[PDB]
Write a protein that binds this ligand. Structure first.
Ligand SMILES: *SCCNC(=O)C1CCN(C(=O)C(C)(C)Oc2ccc(Cl)cc2)CC1
Ligand SMILES: *SCCNC(=O)C1CCN(C(=O)C(C)(C)Oc2ccc(Cl)cc2)CC1
Lengths: 8, 231, 231, 8
């Protein structure tokens, strides 16, 4: 589970 | 309904934390065939990301239980886990296919500016990536080719049109690096992209205002966190 | 489906945070007409409380926007907020009616022990209370009478059959006090019930194990917190 | 918004 772009 | 009413109801659904409703309202707004403002683009993204995010989380939980039960969990398993994982999977594929349909029927072609084009091509890569997380067989190969092609077009445009600290350009590169590592099994390419993206943006951080810096470093930190996990 | 498969799928849905699915699985399990274990009772409650809780939160957000727009928000308002509040309201009423149907068709009558009977009568009071939060006219009066009658029967049984620190007895009294304050507009009765419940349970806390104490005081603290707000 | 019984 890599980190992807957050959603705001 | 009129477009303005659909947008109003999307914003209400957002405040009410009703993300399925929010996505349906924004779908109807998109289908009017006019461009989205930055605000509206973000409403669309927030809505569908919340919906698919819950489905992804559910799918991962179920798939993990299913594997640990195909690992000699014998007699501790009827078909229930597999059946329920398949159900959630079909629902997730439907939502991803709906978003991709909006992107290919309206949003990408109709976008009048490069930043919007990058935003939507990144979204196209992302929802193909989510499909790839659950795909098998020939479907998986097609999906992976489509994700790569969307991400690459977005990357080309962003390098031409956006500064290296632009948060959209950074988030695109971050997500393409995740695609390399997790989906394409190209960890060399993933680590290379994440490090190069970080380095080329670092180089500019000293020119940034307080507010610009916060946006950019939020994404750069995630590049750093992935490099930790991946190295 | 067999009951055991429905329970298994409810537990999977719980791990997957799929509470609508979880509730539907437990509904099917209840409709087999056999009693629920304590575990299963809690699956049922968790599932429907999550579903109605999201609807309640949404309804409160929307209703508040609607009132602040009926407060001279003139020309900042078409029918969108009202229409969407009504939609969420109808959906909430449906879920509450479904739970109440399970309680009246199966759970209360079939319960073979007093603790289960109290648990289900408390649930009956709670879901009538949620209906009362949105009700108007004659519906509201009927609903409030039904909530009071269920809570009162539960209270009578719990005073006969459960010690004053029992967490179920405490949570029942807490929720009946909220009914008095918020629904019946009987704040004298609410404050009286909350204080008496706290005092009679305090009196026993010195006999309780570490684990019993934690359960009981969790609820007693909420009684204290409400008394703060209400006094 | 009073506090009601938590759900575990
Ligand atoms: S229309 C609102 C203003 N326009 C914007 O583009 C956003 C700037 C940054 N932002 C964000 O939430 C973060 C920090 C997550 O940056 C993003 C990175 C990648 C994408 Cl696709 C989107 C945002 C808020 C508004
Ligand atoms: S079948 C599982 C064991 N039985 C129980 O009754 C529960 C004991 C306490 N508990 C709780 O979550 C809290 C502390 C919230 O107490 C309750 C108060 C009121 C109700 Cl209706 C339910 C629980 C866990 C299991």
């Amino acid at each position: 589970r890599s980190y992807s772009s957050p959603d705001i | 309904m009129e477009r303005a009413s659909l947008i109003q109801k999307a914003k209400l659904a957002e405040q009410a934390e009703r993300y399925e409703d929010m996505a349906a309202f924004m779908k109807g707004a998109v289908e009017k065939g006019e461009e989205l403002s930055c605000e509206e683009r973000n409403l669309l993204s927030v809505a569908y990301k919340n919906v698919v995010g819950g489905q992804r989380a559910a799918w991962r939980v179920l798939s993990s239980i299913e594997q640990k039960s195909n690992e000699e969990g014998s007699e501790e398993k009827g078909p229930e886990v597999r059946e329920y994982r398949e159900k959630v999977e079909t629902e997730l594929q439907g939502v991803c296919d709906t978003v991709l349909g909006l992107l290919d029927s309206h949003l990408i072609k109709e976008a009048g500016d490069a930043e919007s084009r990058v935003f939507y091509l990144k979204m196209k890569g992302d929802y193909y990536r989510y499909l790839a997380e659950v795909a098998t067989g020939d479907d998986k190969k097609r999906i992976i080719d489509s994700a790569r092609s969307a991400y690459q077009e977005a990357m080309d445009i962003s390098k031409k049109e956006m500064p290296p600290t632009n948060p959209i350009r950074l988030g695109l590169a971050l997500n393409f690096s995740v695609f390399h590592y997790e989906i394409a099994n190209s960890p060399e390419e993933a680590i290379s992209l994440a490090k190069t993206t970080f380095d080329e943006a670092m180089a500019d951080l000293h020119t940034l205002s307080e507010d610009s810096y916060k946006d950019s470093t939020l994404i750069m930190q995630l590049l750093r966190d992935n490099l930790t996990l991946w190295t």
